Amino acid sequence: XXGXXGXXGXXGXXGXXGXXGXXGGXGXXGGXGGXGGXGXXGXXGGXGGXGGXXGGXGXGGXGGXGGXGXXXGXXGXXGXX
């Protein structure tokens, strides 16, 4: 199976991001993404997303991460396969 993923985001500032996911179809794989969000406090957060890819049974998915605050952020990447 596979596909799905995505969502995440949230928080405020700052916050935001998430997204990504999807891909899959074909023989499956993909998904992932999401995360991001965060912020609050002194601001920052965000990022996440990524994931996706798949369809060919290379894997795909991953991504996410991000979030946190100050600070925080990054994440994303993954996908492909």
């Binding site: 995505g6 949230x10 405020g12 935001x16 998430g18 997204x19 990504x20 996911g21 999807x22 074909x26």
Partner: protein
């Protein structure tokens, strides 16, 4: 500002569903739903994703466009204001 859009679906049997758009962050509009994937011959098309709800602006994301196929997928709901 606006939330992340949902991943577009991809072609297959059936075409995959578009993902719902992300909710807007505080003060932001909703993300758009992904379009539905198109179906190969004899296969259904995917549904469009729902638009994401607004983050207080009154502007929800658009529903994704349904994929064509046998039969075609529906468009997604727009996001709540």
């Amino acid at each position: 500002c606006k939330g992340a859009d949902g991943a577009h679906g991809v072609x297959g049997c059936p075409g995959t569903a578009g993902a719902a758009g992300s909710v807007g962050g505080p003060g932001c509009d909703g993300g758009h739903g992904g379009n539905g994937g198109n179906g190969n011959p004899g296969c259904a098309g995917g549904v469009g994703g729902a638009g994401g709800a607004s983050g207080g602006t009154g502007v929800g994301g658009r529903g994704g466009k349904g994929g064509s196929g046998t039969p075609k997928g529906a468009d997604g709901a727009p996001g709540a204001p």
